[PDB]
Enzyme design. Structure first.
Site, PDB file in Angstrom:
ATOM      1  CD  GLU A 152      40.018  34.314  38.259  1.00 34.57           C
ATOM      2  OE1 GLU A 152      41.352  34.372  38.691  1.00 34.57           O
ATOM      3  OE2 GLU A 152      39.356  35.042  37.958  1.00 34.57           O
ATOM      4  N   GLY A 178      31.519  33.252  39.742  1.00 36.61           N
ATOM      5  CA  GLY A 178      32.103  33.106  38.520  1.00 36.61           C
ATOM      6  C   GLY A 178      32.951  33.478  38.322  1.00 36.61           C
ATOM      7  CB  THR A 179      36.798  32.383  36.390  1.00 39.97           C
ATOM      8  OG1 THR A 179      36.016  32.786  35.663  1.00 39.97           O
ATOM      9  CG2 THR A 179      36.494  31.196  37.578  1.00 39.97           C
ATOM     10  CB  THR A 180      37.378  37.641  35.997  1.00 42.42           C
ATOM     11  OG1 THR A 180      37.790  37.988  37.978  1.00 42.42           O
ATOM     12  CG2 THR A 180      37.552  39.491  35.523  1.00 42.42           C
ATOM     13  CB  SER A 202      31.517  34.870  34.184  1.00 43.08           C
ATOM     14  OG  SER A 202      32.310  35.290  33.890  1.00 43.08           O
TER      15      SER A 202
END
Ligand SMILES: [Cl-]
Lengths: 195, 243, 240, 241, 235, 231, 250, 111, 244
Positions: free
Chosen positions: B46, B29-31, B74
């Site tokens: 993010e 996943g994204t940060t 995330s």
């Protein structure tokens, strides 16, 4: 409903049951048969709350007929009466109890004896030589106490029964439009058409 | 073997491989990050701009629980929403019975026990999210990070997602350089910088920055999103540092 | 509650548990139904690997559902009791609400529906039973014979057989039964039924049961000697 | 071999899921120790905070179950907290139902019974934890009772748990062979804590700062954990002797 | 084994796809829609000559304005028909009107996916639902165990379906009379059936606005069979 | 492989294969497009038939006077989800006298789809949805995936060959977003968008399905001769 | 969620064995030896107290348990399984007997109830069988003294004397040579201690051995006086000191 | 004891012509001897050219109208936007009312 | 989920057999033999205890023969624990009938219901069947003396003489040889013991490895008595027929 009688003699049980169905100030019917055949040698008459009576009678009839088919055998009058008693004994503590009083006349083929059971809506069972439900008993019991003998014939039983109907037709307040009489013996159940 | 095919089964090591597999979904996943500050906490995330067709500012990922707690995560986004929905139920029943809004450590264990429960049976799947959350209560500021296993601790700074190591390194510098403490407004700026620095690990698609904060002095102890002038100021601070 | 979907489709579109229930029927003792001009006769095989039996008390192969309808079967004996019980209860329930005994078609449709329900209900296996249901509708003299099977399909038959070696006796009935002229009498119908079983049975001793149903609740089971007379007569005409 | 996935017997009468839950116990790589004084029961455990970003005050494996009962866990924190919340609820209910504080040994039995159920019922996994319960019981006095994933439990004169448990166990055995008594013959809990840390140092062969340890103390009518400075005060006292 | 509601890697439900194979084994059923009515015809397919064919019931009334034909595991259709009849009568009770043919079909199709680990498996039978209402006139629907239903001008289901459907593609036009449709169902059934088509092994039915849903007698169908044979010989 | 038997199982790389297989059913579905301006939101859908004798499977469903969606994948699953949306929109009206925000509609669908991906016995929904609506914050377009992921967009497309329309809309973004107070032009842009996903087949009169909602326009669907204007 | 295991985990194999029951008996075989001997005026049940650690207080772990004032139990196999069975057994003596008849159940019937509980773990959904064999000794007015063995299957047998667990084969043979129908309770205690020494390896004293009797009524252990018909428990656990006294005249 | 019913007064009237129909009602709303509102409408357009009024206990009246309006909405959803005829509306309203036979809506309804 | 560990106890084999029922019967074939013989004036029940130990208490023991009511008893072959579950159900069922109809339950009715319970465990519920076969010996005033057997499938049949458990094949052949219809109880006692003595897997048949019972009308006038034999009585009857 109202009048149901029963007399056990030497060889048979005779049930007499009133023909009237009254609602309010109107006699709606004068030929009502207040009885159901539970098995070939067992007959049940009934009286009590409208609707409850026939509903209970037919429910018992269905159960005994179911038993008959399952076992290919006829329950004894004693066995049927005990089943009926228990159903009423359950009912009396239900949310809405069956308000039905019954007489069960049967011929036990194993014992070769007639049997008459009186069961009220509470589930109070007694075997009797003669029985009645409701206000009828207040006239017929004393009458039968005097005229009944244990060794009477079916014909003697019918004359004894005529004496009861006559007394009820003389002293009872309501017109119950006569009775349908049925005999239970070794040969099964038959109706007397001219009473 | 086959020990990894069913949740709640111990391997001969004493591990639950299904939970470790859920951790892989989180790493994908994204940060997202969390910075604890003088009198509160700051959250940032993010948001990968997949296409021009995404409406800017209109796919909000940070979530509020009650009026004083913020949550970001995330991994599998729907799984995170399920966890927040439960969090909101837990907080509501706490406030119902005890009147006071749920303390952050109390809230942390509510989520912890719920996530841990999803490692007890083979008829449920573990959560595919690590969740960074916190706020301000009667005892001050608290920041937490919760993982698929149900494990959580208190944090000075927290990071998860594809750029977690980059973000962690940047967080450790702030802890070392500011032993006395970081201010709320400073932490917002730093959060922007760290998300931009952590974006290097996801640099194909360009991104959209999203920040929120709870501060006793700046937001009156309530969770608010950072928008407009304060957001653009934080974006510019971050842009200056990458160059 | 135990929920497992035991009856499911396979890639080729078969429900194997239903089909394997048919194999249990194929293992069961042969049963045959033949309807005449004014009667239906149900014949049943009884295997003779069991000597020292007490035939007074042993469950009979043909069961009365009501005074006018009978049910015979092939397959698992224990399974058949559950179907018979349910059928007998529905028989009394129908009399209670409709004030008329069941038609043979209706009773069959109910039994078949029960069987079907056990093919798409969780936690249950299908009945390992096929039935022959025969009788006469109330106040009707037209003979009725129906067949059901584990899947739940049912249909009417002029004559039909089920159980082990049923394909052999069906072959016999297919050339020996004239649709234009069904067995005109009771004797003719019983004989054709006994003949068909003798293609498969062994000895015509205590191996064959015959039950005759006539209109208006007239059902009787034949005794050994009565059946043995049919066996004796058929063999003497055969030596020709 | 699905007999290794759920809690049913293997051909040799074993429960592998229970055995593997025992191995999950050491996943944290932390050692714990419990001893009894005259008036108190001291429990100590290692505290390892590897990440600099962690808030060290929130990292704990010692729990205050009730006012009188304390519990240290050996095993992963999710399962540890699961056990702690249940123990707290059970102890609270006991007090409400029966009008007196739940004894340490009774809570131990209850938690052991719950653990036993997971070894017999299939849908529930065992918790990968070993629970050490400590108190100064009003009837039995200083008490140490310990639970495992098998549902086994027993009282102890003293005990240890963790990867290097055997070293600590024998170290304690050898002391009680020498002293000839069931406990630490000491008046104050401060010196019983000092004894506990001293004998952990000797057995493990490592030195401890104030942040490498975690201490719980049970006295009559209360169980409490020590702060970093309380432990530091205790470390100084050992060093100056 | 595996879950009953499992998806295949191609994004289809295993059990639904397998039930479609069961339907391909079923006996043929054809329906044609005209402006004068909708005709429904089926192959009876008796397994043995001793079986009394008129007891084979594969065309069924749902209401006066809606009829139904089936193909596949026909025992599975009983509860579907029971539901359809109750849905139709219930709607008339609640709204004092006839229920739309599409609304009926949608109600039946709602049962379809109510399986899993609700019933234990999908239905193994496809239904052709034909009827009339005041809004959309004469309609024919094909109801599958997937829960999907398409309206059709004409449609065949069962073992001979793909061959019969190709034939229906050529023969159907928007001006077909009812009589023309009757003959066309017989013609196409005779083509795809194994045994030779007659009044005993095939059954016709129709639904018209005026007379409602009617299953034809064996005498009436026999004459249509004779009329069909004569017309094919006549050129 | 060994990890696709049910939704409750993660793969070693952290994937849910049953959810991915559900996603695959959408890809096989017929193309549908969604786009909006500041005043209106438009759905365009290519309908699919079984053969020339059959009807064309309806793709668009009305949820409320101000909201509705188009579908791609398992149609019965769209019926279940649309019915749920109808109830949720309805609950909001009866209880709060409030038109359900298109954003909340998205959140509710996400949470309903999610529960089917974490429990034993169940299965993911096998359909993708494009929800359009006009509420108190203007026009909206949402994209629902049965993984649970819901996304707000200016424009998008799902189904087979949806990438063509999705690229076109990405180019046309600056043009169609400013088609305010002009319904027929916003539809024309959507009809041109869906044309970038056609192969061997072209838009006919019983093939095309258009829906529109906006400032002074209730959610209404156009089929048959009412779409002849746009071919 | 919820227990989806509604199906049996113990099933018949083609050979007719019930695997999980067999494997449970295997667990009992691994267990420490316990025994029971029936005398004319009492019953003795005994077992070794296998200590897990010398730091453990083996007094806090009771292998011999009172079920009713006249019934005691000992086991071989899995301790935790035994502990919960004792809880259940104590409760069922009340719920299904004492709360109905106002007196404690006779030994055979309490045994029958425990056996039922163990049988159900052999057939019910989502459970394994209990990994223990029990020996239950007791007294009641109309049956006198009795000794029963209950196995994981739920089967139970009455014994004059027997042993279960580790060295049961040798211990049973030892008991056959020594048992007669004229044994007095003290003679049975003596034989119990002799038989147990064969299977015990390490220390053999009152702290490593657990032993209880079913004998005369103990009015001193009743806790109250004033009711003539209540005369005290027949179950008594021998103290550590009482065992050592008998180990000198061994 | 709590009495779940009240009386909000007012009166309504419906007349039908050859190609039209009127449904009238006063706008007064009362409890006991007090006026709650001089203008509180109780005649409503329910869609599909059906006007409705449920007069008596206003809480029950509003509840019923609310439920019927909602019934019209779902009738469209379930039957392809088909117009709900006045006879069909009537039958539907019977079931709404009789559904609460043992705890009735205390209203006289006219459509 | 839990599907993985489901044995599916209630399914058909490709051949149309019930796996678990077949395997339960295989289990029962290793249990001690039990024999029932029906005479004109009574019924005999004889059963062999499973390999006995000398320290087993023989008099206060019950393993094979159980009393259902005053007129009906059963001989057990299989898992005893399973049998007691069923026996208690049967005992309660008998009392329900007596309470309802004020008449002792006809033997077949009791047998059918117990057999119907067994049937249920083979069709639904996902549980293992009861690993038990019963021999029912009883009397009622309809059919008089009756012998039945039921097995895990829930199928029951009536017999003049029958064996269950181990060596039924050999035992049945021996019973089929020496049984005749006009037989008396005392003759049937001898046949039962002689058959066990020849089919036993033991070295010699002794009193301590047997359970024995008779159901006679050998009370006083028109009533039935159940005699569960004591150890010494089995010792005497074994000497009286010259087996020991
Ligand atoms: Cl407990």
């Amino acid at each position: 409903m109202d009048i149901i009688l029963g007399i056990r003699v030497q060889d048979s049980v005779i049930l007499a049951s009133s023909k009237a169905v009254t609602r309010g100030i109107s006699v709606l019917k004068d030929s009502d048969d207040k009885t159901r055949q539970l098995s070939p040698h067992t007959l049940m008459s009934f009286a009590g709350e409208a609707g409850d009576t026939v509903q209970f009678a037919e429910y018992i009839q269905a159960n005994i007929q179911l038993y008959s088919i399952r076992e290919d055998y006829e329950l004894s009058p004693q066995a049927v009466s005990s089943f009926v008693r228990q159903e009423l004994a359950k009912s009396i503590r239900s949310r809405r109890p069956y308000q039905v009083n019954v007489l069960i006349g049967g011929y036990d083929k194993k014992k070769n004896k007639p049997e008459l059971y009186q069961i009220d809506y509470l589930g109070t069972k007694v075997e009797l030589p003669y029985g009645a439900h409701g206000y009828s008993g207040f006239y017929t019991f004393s009458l039968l106490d005097h005229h009944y003998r244990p060794d009477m014939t079916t014909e003697e039983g019918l004359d004894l029964l005529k004496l009861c109907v006559q007394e009820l037709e003389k002293r009872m307040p309501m017109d119950f439009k006569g009775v349908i009489v049925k005999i239970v013996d070794k040969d099964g159940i038959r109706q007397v058409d001219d009473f | 073997t086959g020990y990894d095919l069913s949740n709640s089964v111990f391997s001969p090591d004493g591990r639950n491989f299904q939970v470790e597999y859920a951790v892989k979904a989180v790493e994908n996943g994204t940060t997202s990050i969390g910075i604890k500050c003088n009198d509160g906490v700051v959250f940032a995330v993010e948001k990968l701009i997949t296409s021009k067709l995404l409406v800017p500012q209109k796919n909000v990922k940070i979530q509020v629980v009650d009026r004083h707690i913020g949550c970001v995560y995330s991994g599998l986004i729907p799984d995170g929403r399920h966890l927040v929905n439960r969090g909101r139920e837990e907080a509501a029943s706490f406030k119902k019975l005890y009147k006071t809004p749920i303390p952050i450590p109390a809230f942390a264990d509510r989520l912890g026990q719920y996530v841990q429960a999803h490692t007890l049976y083979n008829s449920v799947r573990p959560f595919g999210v690590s969740t960074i959350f916190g706020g301000v209560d009667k005892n001050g500021a608290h920041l937490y990070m919760l993982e698929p296993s149900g494990s959580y601790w208190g944090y000075k700074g927290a990071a998860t997602g594809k750029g977690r190591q980059s973000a962690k390194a940047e967080l450790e510098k702030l802890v070392d350089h500011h032993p006395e403490g970081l201010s709320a407004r400073e932490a917002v700026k730093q959060a922007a910088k760290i998300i931009y620095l952590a974006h290097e690990d996801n640099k194909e698609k360009d991104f959209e920055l999203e920040i929120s904060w709870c501060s006793l002095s700046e937001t009156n102890g309530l969770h608010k999103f950072v928008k407009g002038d304060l957001l653009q100021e934080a974006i510019d601070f971050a842009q200056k540092e990458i160059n | 509650g135990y929920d497992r979907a035991l009856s499911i489709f396979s890639p080729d579109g078969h429900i194997f548990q239903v089909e394997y229930a048919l194999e249990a029927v194929k293992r069961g003792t042969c049963a045959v139904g033949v309807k005449g001009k004014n009667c239906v006769v149900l014949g049943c095989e009884r295997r003779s690997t069991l000597k020292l039996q007490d035939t007074r008390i042993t469950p009979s192969k043909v069961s009365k559902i009501d005074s006018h309808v009978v049910l015979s079967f092939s397959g698992l004996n224990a399974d058949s009791r559950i179907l018979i019980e349910k059928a007998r209860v529905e028989a009394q329930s129908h009399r209670l609400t409709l004030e008329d005994p069941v038609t043979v078609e209706y009773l069959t449709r109910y039994v078949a529906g029960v069987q079907q329900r056990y093919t798409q209900s969780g936690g249950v296996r299908p009945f390992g039973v096929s039935t022959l249901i025969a009788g006469f509708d109330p106040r009707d003299d037209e003979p009725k014979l129906y067949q059901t099977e584990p899947s739940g399909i049912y249909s009417s038959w002029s004559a039909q057989t089920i159980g082990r070696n049923s394909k052999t006796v069906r072959e016999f009935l297919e050339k020996n039964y004239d649709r234009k002229e069904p067995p005109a009498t009771v004797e003719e119908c019983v004989k054709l039924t006994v003949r068909s079983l003798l293609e498969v049975v062994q000895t015509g001793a205590k191996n064959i049961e015959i039950t005759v149903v006539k209109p208006d609740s007239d059902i009787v089971a034949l005794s050994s000697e009565e059946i043995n007379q049919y066996v004796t007569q058929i063999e003497q005409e055969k030596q020709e | 071999g699905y007999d290794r996935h759920i809690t049913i017997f293997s051909p040799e009468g074993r429960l592998y899921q229970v055995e593997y839950a025992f191995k999950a116990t050491n996943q944290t790589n932390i050692n714990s120790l419990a001893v009894r004084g005259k008036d108190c029961t001291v429990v100590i455990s290692q505290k390892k905070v590897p990440d600099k970003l962690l808030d060290p005050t929130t990292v704990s494996y010692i729990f205050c179950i009730s006012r009188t009962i304390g519990m240290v866990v050996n095993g992963p924190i999710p399962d540890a907290r699961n056990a702690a919340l249940r123990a707290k609820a059970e102890a609270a209910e006991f007090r409400y139902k029966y009008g007196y504080d739940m004894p340490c040994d009774v809570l131990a039995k209850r938690m052991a019974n719950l653990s036993q159920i997971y070894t017999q019922r299939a849908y529930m996994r065992p918790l990968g934890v070993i629970l050490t319960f400590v108190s100064v019981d009003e009837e039995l006095g200083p008490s140490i009772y310990k639970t495992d994933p098998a549902g086994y439990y027993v009282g102890y004169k003293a005990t240890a748990t963790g990867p290097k448990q055997q070293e600590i166990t024998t170290n304690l055995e050898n002391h009680f062979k020498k002293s000839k008594i069931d406990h630490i013959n000491e008046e104050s809990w401060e010196k019983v804590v000092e004894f506990a840390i001293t004998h952990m140092i000797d057995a493990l062969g490592t030195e401890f700062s104030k942040n490498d340890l975690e201490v719980g103390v049970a006295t009559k009518d209360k169980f409490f954990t020590l702060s970093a400075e309380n432990i530091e005060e205790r470390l100084v006292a050992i060093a100056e002797q | 084994d595996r879950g009953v509601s499992t998806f295949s890697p191609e994004g289809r439900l295993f059990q639904v796809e397998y039930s479609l194979e069961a339907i391909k084994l079923g006996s043929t059923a054809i329906g044609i829609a005209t402006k004068e009515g909708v005709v429904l015809g089926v192959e009876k397919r008796a397994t043995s000559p001793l079986l009394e064919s008129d007891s084979i019931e594969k065309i069924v009334e749902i209401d006066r304005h809606i009829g139904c034909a089936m193909s596949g595991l026909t025992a599975d259709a009983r509860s579907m028909i029971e539901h359809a009849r109750t849905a139709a009568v219930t709607h008339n009770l609640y709204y004092d009107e006839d229920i739309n043919v599409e609304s009926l079909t949608q109600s039946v199709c709602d049962l379809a996916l109510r399986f899993g680990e609700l019933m234990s498996r999908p239905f193994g039978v496809a239904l052709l639902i034909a009827g009339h209402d005041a809004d959309d006139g004469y309609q024919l629907f094909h109801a599958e165990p997937s829960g999907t239903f398409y309206r059709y001008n004409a449609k065949a289901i069962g073992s001979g379906s793909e061959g019969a459907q190709a034939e229906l593609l050529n023969e159907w036009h928007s001006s077909l009379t009812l009589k023309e449709a009757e003959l066309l169902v017989l013609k196409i059934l005779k083509q795809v059936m194994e045994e030779k088509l007659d009044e005993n092994n095939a059954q016709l039915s129709c639904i018209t606005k005026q007379d409602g849903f009617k299953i034809y007698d064996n005498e009436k169908t026999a004459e249509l069979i004779k009329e069909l044979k004569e017309k094919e010989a006549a050129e | 492989n060994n990890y696709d038997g049910d939704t409750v199982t993660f793969s070693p790389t952290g994937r849910l294969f049953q959810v991915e297989y559900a996603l695959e059913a959408i890809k096989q579905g017929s193309v549908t497009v969604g786009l909006r301006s500041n005043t209106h939101a438009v759905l365009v859908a290519l309908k699919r038939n079984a053969d020339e004798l059959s009807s064309y499977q309806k793709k668009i469903i009305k949820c409320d006077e101000h909201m509705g969606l188009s579908l791609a994948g398992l149609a019965p699953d769209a019926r279940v989800l649309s019915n749920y949306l109808r109830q949720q929109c309805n609950y909001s009206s009866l209880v709060f006298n409030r038109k359900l925000a298109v954003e909340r509609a998205g959140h509710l669908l996400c949470d309903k789809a999610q529960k089917n991906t974490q429990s034993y016995g169940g299965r993911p929904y096998g359909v993708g949805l494009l929800i359009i609506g006009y509420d108190k914050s203007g026009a909206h377009l949402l994209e629902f995936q049965p993984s649970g992921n819901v996304t707000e967009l200016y424009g998008t497309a799902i189904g087979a060959r949806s990438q063509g329309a999705k690229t076109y809309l990405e180019r046309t973004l600056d043009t169609f977003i400013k088609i305010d107070g002009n319904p027929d032009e916003l539809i024309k842009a959507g009809v041109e968008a869906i044309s970038q996903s056609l192969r061997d087949e072209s838009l006919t009169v019983d093939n095309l399905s258009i829906a529109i909602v906006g400032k002074d326009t209730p959610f209404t669907i156009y089929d048959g001769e009412a779409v002849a204007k746009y071919i | 969620m919820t227990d989806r295991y509604s199906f049996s985990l113990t099933t018949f194999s083609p050979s007719g064995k019930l695997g999980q029951i067999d494997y449970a008996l295997t667990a009992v075989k691994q267990g420490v030896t316990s025994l029971g001997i029936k005398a004319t005026n009492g019953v003795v049940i005994a077992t070794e107290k296998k200590s897990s650690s010398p730091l453990a207080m083996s007094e806090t772990l009771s292998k011999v348990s009172l079920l009713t004032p006249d019934i005691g139990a000992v086991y071989s196999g899995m301790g935790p399984d035994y502990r919960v069975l004792v809880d259940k057994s104590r409760k069922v003596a009340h719920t299904s007997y004492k709360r109905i008849y106002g007196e404690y159940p006779p030994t055979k019937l309490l045994v029958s109830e425990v056996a039922k509980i163990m049988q159900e773990a052999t057939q019910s959904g989502g459970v394994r069988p209990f990994g223990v064999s029990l020996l239950i000794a007791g007294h009641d007015e109309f049956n006198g003294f009795s000794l029963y063995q209950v196995d994981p299957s739920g089967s139970y047998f009455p014994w004059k004397a027997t042993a279960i667990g580790k060295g049961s084969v040798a211990a049973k043979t030892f008991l056959e040579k020594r048992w007669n129908d004229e044994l007095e309770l003290e003679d049975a205690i003596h034989i119990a201690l002799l038989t147990l020494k064969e299977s015990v390896e390490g220390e053999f004293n009152g702290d490593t051995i657990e032993l209880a009797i079913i004998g005369d009524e103990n009015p001193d252990l009743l806790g109250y006086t004033g009711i003539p018909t209540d005369k005290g428990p027949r179950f008594r656990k021998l103290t550590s000191q009482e065992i050592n006294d008998r180990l000198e005249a061994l | 004891q709590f009495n779940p019913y009240g009386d909000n007064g007012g009166t309504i009237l419906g007349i039908a012509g050859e190609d039209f129909a009127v449904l009238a009602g006063d706008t007064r709303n009362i409890t006991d001897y007090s006026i709650n509102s001089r203008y509180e409408p109780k005649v409503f357009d329910c869609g599909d050219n059906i006007v409705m009024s449920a007069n008596g206990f206003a809480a029950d009246g509003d509840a019923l109208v609310k439920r019927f309006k909602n019934s019209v909405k779902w009738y469209h959803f379930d039957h392809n936007d088909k117009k709900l005829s006045i006879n069909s509306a009537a039958r539907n309203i019977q079931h709404l009312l009789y559904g609460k036979r043992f705890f009735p809506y205390y209203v006289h309804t006219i459509i | 989920g839990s599907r993985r560990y489901d044995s599916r106890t209630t399914i058909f084999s490709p051949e149309g057999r019930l796996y678990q029922v077949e395997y339960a019967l295989e289990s029962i074939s290793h249990a001690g033999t039990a024999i029932g013989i029906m005479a004109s004036d009574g019924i005999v029940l004889a059963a062999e205890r499973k390999v006995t130990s000398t320290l087993l208490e023989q008099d206060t023991s019950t393993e094979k023969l159980y009393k259902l009511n005053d007129k009906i008893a059963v001989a057990v072959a299989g898992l005893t624990a399973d049998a007691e579950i069923l026996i208690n159900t049967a005992r309660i069922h008998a009392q329900n009938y007596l309470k309802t109809y004020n008449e002792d339950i006809p033997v077949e009715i009791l047998v059918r219901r117990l057999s119907d319970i067994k049937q249920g465990y083979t069709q639904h519920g996902g549980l293992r069947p009861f690993g038990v076969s019963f021999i029912y010996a009883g009397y009622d005033d309809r059919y008089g003396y009756q012998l039945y057997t039921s097995n895990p499938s829930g199928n029951y049949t009536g017999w003049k003489a029958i064996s269950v458990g181990a060596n039924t094949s050999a035992a049945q052949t021996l019973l089929q040889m020496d049984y005749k219809d006009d037989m008396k109880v005392d003759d049937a006692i001898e046949l039962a013991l002689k058959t066990l003595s020849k089919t036993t897997d033991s070295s010699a048949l002794t009193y301590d490895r047997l359970e024995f019972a008779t159901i006679r009308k050998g009370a006083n006038d028109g009533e039935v008595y159940q005699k569960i034999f004591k150890p010494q009585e089995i010792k005497d009857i074994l000497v009286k027929t010259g087996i020991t």
